[PDB]
mmCIF file of C-alpha atoms and ligand atoms in Angstrom:
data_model
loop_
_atom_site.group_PDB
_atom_site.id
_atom_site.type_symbol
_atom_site.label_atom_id
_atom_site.label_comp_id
_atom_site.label_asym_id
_atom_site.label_seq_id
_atom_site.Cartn_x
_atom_site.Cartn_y
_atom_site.Cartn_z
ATOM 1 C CA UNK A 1 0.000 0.000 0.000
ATOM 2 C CA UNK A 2 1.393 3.830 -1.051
ATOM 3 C CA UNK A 3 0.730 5.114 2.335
ATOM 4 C CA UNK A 4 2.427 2.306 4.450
ATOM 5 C CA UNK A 5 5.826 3.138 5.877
ATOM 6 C CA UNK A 6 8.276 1.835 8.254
ATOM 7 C CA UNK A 7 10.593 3.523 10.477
ATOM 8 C CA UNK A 8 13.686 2.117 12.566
ATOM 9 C CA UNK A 9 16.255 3.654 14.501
ATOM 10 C CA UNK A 10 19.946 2.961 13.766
ATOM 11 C CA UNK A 11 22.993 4.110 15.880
ATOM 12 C CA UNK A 12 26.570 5.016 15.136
ATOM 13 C CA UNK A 13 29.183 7.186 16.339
ATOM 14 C CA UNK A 14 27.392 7.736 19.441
ATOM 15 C CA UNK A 15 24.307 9.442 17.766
ATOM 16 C CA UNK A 16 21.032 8.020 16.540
ATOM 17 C CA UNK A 17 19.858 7.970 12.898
ATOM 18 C CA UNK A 18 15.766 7.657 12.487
ATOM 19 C CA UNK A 19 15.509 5.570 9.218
ATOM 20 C CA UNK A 20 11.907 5.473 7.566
ATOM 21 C CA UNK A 21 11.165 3.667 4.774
ATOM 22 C CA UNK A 22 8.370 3.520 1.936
ATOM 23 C CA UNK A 23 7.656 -0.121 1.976
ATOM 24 C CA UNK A 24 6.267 -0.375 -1.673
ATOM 25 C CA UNK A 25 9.217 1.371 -2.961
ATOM 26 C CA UNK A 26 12.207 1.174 -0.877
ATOM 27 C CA UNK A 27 12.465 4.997 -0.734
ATOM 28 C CA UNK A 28 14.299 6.245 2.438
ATOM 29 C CA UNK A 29 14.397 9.366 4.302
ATOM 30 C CA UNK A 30 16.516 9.760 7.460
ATOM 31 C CA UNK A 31 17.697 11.984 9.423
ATOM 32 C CA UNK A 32 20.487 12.286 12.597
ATOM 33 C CA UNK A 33 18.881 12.914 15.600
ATOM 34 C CA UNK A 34 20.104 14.219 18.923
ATOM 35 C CA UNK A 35 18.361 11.579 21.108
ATOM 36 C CA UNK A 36 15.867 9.000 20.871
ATOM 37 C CA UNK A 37 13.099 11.166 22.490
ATOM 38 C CA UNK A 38 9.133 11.509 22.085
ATOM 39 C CA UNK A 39 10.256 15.338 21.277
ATOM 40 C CA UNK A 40 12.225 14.266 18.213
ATOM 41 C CA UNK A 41 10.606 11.673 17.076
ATOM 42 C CA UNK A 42 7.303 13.867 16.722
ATOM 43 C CA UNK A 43 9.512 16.202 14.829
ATOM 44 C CA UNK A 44 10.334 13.512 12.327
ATOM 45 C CA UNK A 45 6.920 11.866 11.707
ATOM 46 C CA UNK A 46 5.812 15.580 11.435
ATOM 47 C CA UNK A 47 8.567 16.315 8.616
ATOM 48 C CA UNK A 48 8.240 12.908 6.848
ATOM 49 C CA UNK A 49 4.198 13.597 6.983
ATOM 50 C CA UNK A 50 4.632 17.311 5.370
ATOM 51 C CA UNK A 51 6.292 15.829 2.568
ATOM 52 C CA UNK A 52 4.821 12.331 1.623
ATOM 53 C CA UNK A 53 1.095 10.691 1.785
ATOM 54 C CA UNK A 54 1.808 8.704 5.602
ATOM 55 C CA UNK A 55 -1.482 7.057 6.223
ATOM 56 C CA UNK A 56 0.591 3.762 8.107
ATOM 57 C CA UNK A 57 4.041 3.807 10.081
ATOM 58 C CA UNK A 58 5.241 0.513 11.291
ATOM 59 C CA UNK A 59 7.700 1.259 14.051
ATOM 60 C CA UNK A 60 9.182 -0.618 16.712
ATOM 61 C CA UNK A 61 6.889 0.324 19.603
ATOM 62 C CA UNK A 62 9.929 1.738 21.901
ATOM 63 C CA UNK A 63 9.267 4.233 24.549
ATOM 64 C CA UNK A 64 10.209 7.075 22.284
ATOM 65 C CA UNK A 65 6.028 6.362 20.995
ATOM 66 C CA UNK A 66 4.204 6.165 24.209
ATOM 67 C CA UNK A 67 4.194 9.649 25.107
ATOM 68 C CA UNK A 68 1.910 12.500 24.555
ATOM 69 C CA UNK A 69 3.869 14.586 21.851
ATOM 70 C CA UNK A 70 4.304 11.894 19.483
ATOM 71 C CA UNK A 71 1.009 10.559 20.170
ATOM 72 C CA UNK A 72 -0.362 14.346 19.152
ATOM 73 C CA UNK A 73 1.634 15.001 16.116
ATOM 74 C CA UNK A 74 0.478 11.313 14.858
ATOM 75 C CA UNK A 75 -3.015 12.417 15.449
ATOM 76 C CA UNK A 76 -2.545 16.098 14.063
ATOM 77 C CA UNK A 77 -0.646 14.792 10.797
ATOM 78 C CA UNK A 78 -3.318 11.700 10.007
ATOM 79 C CA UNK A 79 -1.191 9.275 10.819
ATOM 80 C CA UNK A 80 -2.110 5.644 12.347
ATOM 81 C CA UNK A 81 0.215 2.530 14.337
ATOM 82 C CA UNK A 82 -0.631 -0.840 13.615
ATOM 83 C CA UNK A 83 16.215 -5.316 7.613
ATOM 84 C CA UNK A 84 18.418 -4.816 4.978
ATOM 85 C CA UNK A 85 18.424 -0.888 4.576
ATOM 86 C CA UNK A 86 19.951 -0.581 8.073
ATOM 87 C CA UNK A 87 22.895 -2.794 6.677
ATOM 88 C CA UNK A 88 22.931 -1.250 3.278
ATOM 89 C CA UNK A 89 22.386 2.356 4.340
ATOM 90 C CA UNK A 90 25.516 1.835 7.175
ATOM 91 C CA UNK A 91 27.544 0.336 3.944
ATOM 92 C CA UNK A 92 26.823 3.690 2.100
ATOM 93 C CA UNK A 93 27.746 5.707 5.048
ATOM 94 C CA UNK A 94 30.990 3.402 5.142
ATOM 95 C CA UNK A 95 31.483 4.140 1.771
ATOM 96 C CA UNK A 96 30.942 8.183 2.530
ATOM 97 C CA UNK A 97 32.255 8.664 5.640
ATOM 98 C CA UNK A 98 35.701 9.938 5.305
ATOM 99 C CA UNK A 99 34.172 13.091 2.664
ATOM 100 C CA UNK A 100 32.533 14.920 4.832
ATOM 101 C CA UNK A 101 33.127 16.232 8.568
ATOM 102 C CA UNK A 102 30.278 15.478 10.325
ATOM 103 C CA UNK A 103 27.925 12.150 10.527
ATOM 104 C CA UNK A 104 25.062 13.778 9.415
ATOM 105 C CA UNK A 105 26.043 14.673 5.953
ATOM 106 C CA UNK A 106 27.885 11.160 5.520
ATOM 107 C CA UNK A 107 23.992 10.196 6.043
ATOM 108 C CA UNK A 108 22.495 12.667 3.476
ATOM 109 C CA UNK A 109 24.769 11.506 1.288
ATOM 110 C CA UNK A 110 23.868 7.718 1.858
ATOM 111 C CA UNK A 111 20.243 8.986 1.363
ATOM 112 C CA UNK A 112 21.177 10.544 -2.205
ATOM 113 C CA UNK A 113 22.986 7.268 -3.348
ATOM 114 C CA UNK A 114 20.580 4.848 -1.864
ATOM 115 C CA UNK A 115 17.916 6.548 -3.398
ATOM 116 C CA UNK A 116 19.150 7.212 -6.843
ATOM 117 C CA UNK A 117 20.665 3.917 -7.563
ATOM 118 C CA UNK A 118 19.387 2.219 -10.188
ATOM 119 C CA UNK A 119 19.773 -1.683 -10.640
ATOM 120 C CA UNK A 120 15.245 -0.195 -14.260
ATOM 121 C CA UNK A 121 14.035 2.146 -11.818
ATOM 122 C CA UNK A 122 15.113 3.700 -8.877
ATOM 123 C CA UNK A 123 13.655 4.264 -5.572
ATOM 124 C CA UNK A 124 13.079 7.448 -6.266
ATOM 125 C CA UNK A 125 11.077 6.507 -9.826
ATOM 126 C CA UNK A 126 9.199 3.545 -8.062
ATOM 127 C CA UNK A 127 8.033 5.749 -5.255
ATOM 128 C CA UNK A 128 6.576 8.531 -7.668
ATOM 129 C CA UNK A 129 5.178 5.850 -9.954
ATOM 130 C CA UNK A 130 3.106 3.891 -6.966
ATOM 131 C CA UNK A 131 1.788 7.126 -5.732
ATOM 132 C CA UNK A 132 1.015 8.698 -8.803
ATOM 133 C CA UNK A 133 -0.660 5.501 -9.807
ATOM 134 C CA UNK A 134 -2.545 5.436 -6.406
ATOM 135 C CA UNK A 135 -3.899 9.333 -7.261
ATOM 136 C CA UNK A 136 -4.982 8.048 -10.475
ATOM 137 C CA UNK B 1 10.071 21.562 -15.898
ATOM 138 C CA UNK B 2 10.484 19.013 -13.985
ATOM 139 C CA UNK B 3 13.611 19.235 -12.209
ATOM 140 C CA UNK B 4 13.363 22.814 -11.482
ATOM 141 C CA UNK B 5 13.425 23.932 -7.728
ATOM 142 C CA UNK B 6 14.108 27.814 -6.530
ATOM 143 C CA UNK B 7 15.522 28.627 -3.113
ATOM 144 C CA UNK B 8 14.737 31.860 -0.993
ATOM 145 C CA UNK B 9 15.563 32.509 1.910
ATOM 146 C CA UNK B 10 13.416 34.342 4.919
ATOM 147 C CA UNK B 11 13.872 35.496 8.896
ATOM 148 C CA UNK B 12 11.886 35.104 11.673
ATOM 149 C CA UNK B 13 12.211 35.530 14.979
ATOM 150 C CA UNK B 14 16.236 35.668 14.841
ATOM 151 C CA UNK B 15 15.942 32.659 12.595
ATOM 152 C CA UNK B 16 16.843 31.944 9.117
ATOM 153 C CA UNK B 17 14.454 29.742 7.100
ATOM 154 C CA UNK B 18 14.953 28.442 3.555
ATOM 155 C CA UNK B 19 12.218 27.423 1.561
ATOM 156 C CA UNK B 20 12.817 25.049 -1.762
ATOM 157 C CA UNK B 21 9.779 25.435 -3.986
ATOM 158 C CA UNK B 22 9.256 23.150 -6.587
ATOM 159 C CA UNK B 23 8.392 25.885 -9.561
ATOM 160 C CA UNK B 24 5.907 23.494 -11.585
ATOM 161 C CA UNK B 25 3.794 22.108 -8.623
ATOM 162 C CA UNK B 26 3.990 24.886 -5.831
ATOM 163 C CA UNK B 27 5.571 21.731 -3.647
ATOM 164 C CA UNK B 28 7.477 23.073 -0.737
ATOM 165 C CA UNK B 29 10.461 21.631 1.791
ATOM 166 C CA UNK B 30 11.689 23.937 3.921
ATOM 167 C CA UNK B 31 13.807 24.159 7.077
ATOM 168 C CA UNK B 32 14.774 26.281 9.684
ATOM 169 C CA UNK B 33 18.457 26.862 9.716
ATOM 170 C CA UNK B 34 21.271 28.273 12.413
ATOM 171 C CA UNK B 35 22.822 30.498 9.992
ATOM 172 C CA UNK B 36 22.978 31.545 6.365
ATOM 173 C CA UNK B 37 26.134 29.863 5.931
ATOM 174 C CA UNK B 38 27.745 28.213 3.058
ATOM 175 C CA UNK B 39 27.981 25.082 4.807
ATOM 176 C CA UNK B 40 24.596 25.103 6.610
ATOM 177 C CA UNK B 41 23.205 25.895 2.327
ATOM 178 C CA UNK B 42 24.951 23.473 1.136
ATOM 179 C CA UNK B 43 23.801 20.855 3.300
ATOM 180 C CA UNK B 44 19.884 21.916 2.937
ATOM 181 C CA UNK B 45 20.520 21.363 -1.217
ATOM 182 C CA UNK B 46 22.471 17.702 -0.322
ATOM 183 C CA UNK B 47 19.001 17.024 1.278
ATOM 184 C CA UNK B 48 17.217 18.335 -1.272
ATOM 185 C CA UNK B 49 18.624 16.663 -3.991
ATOM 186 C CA UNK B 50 18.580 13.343 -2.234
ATOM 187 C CA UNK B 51 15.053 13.120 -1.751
ATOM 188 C CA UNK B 52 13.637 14.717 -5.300
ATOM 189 C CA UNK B 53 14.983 14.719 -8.695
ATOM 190 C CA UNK B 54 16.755 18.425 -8.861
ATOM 191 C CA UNK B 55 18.459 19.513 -12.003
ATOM 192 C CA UNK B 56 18.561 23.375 -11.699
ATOM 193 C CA UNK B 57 18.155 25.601 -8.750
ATOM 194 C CA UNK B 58 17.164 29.509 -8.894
ATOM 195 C CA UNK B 59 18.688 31.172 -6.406
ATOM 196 C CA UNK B 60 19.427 34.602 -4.947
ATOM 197 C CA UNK B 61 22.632 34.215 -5.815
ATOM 198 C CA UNK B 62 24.239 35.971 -2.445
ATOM 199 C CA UNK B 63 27.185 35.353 -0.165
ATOM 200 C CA UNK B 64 26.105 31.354 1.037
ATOM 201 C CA UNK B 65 26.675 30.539 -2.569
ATOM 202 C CA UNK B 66 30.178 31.578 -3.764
ATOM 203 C CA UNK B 67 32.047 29.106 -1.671
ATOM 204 C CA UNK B 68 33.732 26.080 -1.840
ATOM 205 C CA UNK B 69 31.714 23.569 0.183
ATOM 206 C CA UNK B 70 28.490 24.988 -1.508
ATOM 207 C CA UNK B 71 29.790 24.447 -5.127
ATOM 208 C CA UNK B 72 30.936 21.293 -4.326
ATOM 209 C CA UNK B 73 27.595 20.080 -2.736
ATOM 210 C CA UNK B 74 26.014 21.200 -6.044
ATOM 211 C CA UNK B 75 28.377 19.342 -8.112
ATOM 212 C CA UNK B 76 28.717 16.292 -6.717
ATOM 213 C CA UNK B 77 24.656 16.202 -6.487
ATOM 214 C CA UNK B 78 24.700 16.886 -10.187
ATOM 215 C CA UNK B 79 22.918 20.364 -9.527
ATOM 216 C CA UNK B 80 23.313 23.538 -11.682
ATOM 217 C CA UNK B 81 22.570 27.236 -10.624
ATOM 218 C CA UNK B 82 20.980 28.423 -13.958
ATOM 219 C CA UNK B 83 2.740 33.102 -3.692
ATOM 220 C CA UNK B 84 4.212 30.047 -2.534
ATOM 221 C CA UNK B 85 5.935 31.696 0.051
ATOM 222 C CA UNK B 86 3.966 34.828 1.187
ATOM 223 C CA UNK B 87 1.306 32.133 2.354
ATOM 224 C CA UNK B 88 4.058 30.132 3.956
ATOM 225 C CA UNK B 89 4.492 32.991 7.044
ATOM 226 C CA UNK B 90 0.952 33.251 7.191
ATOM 227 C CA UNK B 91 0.442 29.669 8.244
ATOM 228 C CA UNK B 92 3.399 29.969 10.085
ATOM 229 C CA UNK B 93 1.680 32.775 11.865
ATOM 230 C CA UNK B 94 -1.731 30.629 12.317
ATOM 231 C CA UNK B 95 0.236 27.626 14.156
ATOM 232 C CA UNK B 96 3.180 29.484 15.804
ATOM 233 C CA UNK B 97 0.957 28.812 19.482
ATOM 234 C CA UNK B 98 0.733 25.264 19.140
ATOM 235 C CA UNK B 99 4.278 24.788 19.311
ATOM 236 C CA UNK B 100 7.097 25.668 21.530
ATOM 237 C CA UNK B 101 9.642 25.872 18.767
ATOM 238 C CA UNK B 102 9.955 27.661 15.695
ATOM 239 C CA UNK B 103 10.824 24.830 13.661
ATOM 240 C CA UNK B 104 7.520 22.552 14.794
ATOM 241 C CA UNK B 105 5.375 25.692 13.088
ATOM 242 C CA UNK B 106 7.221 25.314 9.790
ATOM 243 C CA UNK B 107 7.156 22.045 9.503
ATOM 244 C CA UNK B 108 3.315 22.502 10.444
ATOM 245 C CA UNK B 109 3.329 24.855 7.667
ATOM 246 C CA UNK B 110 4.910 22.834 5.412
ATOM 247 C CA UNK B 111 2.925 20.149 6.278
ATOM 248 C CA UNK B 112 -0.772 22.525 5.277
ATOM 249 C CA UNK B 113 0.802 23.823 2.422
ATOM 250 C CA UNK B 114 1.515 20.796 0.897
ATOM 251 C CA UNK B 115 -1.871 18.933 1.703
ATOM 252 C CA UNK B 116 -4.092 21.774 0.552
ATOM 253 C CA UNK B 117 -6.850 20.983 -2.055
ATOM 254 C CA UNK B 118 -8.420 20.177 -7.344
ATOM 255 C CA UNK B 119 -4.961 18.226 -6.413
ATOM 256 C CA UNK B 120 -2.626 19.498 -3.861
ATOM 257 C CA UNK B 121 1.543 20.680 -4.447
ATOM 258 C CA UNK B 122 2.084 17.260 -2.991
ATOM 259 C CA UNK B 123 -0.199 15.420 -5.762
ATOM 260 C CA UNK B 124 1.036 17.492 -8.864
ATOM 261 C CA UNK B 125 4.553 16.915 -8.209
ATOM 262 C CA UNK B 126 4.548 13.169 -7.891
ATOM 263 C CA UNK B 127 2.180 14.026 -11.188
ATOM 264 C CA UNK B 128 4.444 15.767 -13.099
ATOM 265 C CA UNK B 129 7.726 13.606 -11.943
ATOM 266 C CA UNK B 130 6.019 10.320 -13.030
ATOM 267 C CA UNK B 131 4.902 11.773 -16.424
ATOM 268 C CA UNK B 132 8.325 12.814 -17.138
ATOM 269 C CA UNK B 133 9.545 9.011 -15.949
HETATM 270 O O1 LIG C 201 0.095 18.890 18.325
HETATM 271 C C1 LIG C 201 1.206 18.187 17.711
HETATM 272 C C2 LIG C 201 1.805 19.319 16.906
HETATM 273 C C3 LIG C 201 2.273 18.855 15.542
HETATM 274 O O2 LIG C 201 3.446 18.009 15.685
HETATM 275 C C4 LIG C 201 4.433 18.241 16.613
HETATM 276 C C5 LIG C 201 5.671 17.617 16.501
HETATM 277 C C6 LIG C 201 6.653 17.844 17.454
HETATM 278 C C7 LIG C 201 6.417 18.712 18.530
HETATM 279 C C8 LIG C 201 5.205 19.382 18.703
HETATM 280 C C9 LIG C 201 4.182 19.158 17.760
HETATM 281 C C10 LIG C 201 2.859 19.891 17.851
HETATM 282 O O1 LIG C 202 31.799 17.188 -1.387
HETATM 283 C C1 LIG C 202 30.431 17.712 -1.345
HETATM 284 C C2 LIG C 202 29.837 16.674 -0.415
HETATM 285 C C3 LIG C 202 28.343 16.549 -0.553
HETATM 286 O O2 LIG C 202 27.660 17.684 0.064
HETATM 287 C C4 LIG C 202 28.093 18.346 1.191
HETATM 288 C C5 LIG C 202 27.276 19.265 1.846
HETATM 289 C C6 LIG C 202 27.749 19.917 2.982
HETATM 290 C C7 LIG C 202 29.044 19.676 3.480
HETATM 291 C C8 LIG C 202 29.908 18.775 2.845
HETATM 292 C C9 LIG C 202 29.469 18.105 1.683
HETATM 293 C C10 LIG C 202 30.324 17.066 0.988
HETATM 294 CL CL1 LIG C 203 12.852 4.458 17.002
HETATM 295 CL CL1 LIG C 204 19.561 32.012 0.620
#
């Protein structure tokens, strides 16, 4: 389904990456995050909602979703509850690392690649295509 | 044109805020920002470019875009420098109380613009994008 995504956390270097991912598509956007908090994580859902149509997130039920700001921005944004990116994306960031200073553009950059990689289509073409196919 | 995004920058409350607009669909990302910096631009665009197809940015052309780590953002991204917004403060403006922190209320913002409908920014870009494909 074009609404249905899943999100993860990854860590490295000390900080925490939020990883979500279209499920249809394979399309990622993540972010580095200061802490695993209800604070940022409502920031996140918030951003990836502004942006895409998120009708589903599949998360891992930690304690960074059982408070009252992410349980508001969820309701406020629309959005309900109900493996090998991690790996990947971490390779890419391998790959990256050394260009840039600070983790957070090594991640970016991991983003662009991952992405824009095509194997076809990309992510980035099969995520347009099953959304623009779900408008239609 | 598909591919074509323009970047503007705007203040608020000691802030800086730049605001990508996709020129074809009226799409918007924006993001509040620490300082109009070279590095702080070039790492918006990085985003940018990662997450939609961006061939050519408009720009203002001013100080955060005659530097090194800017120009070399855009080239390794494979970007050129060859109403949307006004609206953007006023929502800002209706949702600034239901957050502590600037950056919520843009991403609020962003969030409305985006969403509004007889197909919303959000709808014609994926539109236009997958026609192109
Ligand atoms: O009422 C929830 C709104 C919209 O989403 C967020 C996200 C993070 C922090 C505050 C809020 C307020
Ligand atoms: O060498 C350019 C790359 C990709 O983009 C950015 C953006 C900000 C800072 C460093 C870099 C490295
Ligand atoms: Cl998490
Ligand atoms: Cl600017």
């Amino acid at each position: 389904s074009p609404g249905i995504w899943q999100l993860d956390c990854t860590h490295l270097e000390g900080k925490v990456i939020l990883v979500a991912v279209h499920v249809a598509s394979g399309y990622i956007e993540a972010e580095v995050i200061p802490a695993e908090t209800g604070q940022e994580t409502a920031y996140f859902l918030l951003k990836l909602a502004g942006r895409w149509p998120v009708k589903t997130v599949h998360t891992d039920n930690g304690s960074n979703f059982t408070g009252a700001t992410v349980r508001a921005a969820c309701d406020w944004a629309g959005i309900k509850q109900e493996e090998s990116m991690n790996k990947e994306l971490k390779k890419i960031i391998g790959q990256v690392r050394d260009q840039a200073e600070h983790l957070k553009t090594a991640v970016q950059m991991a983003v662009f690649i991952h992405n824009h990689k095509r194997k076809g289509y990309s992510a980035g073409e099969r995520i347009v295509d099953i959304i623009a196919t779900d408008i239609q």
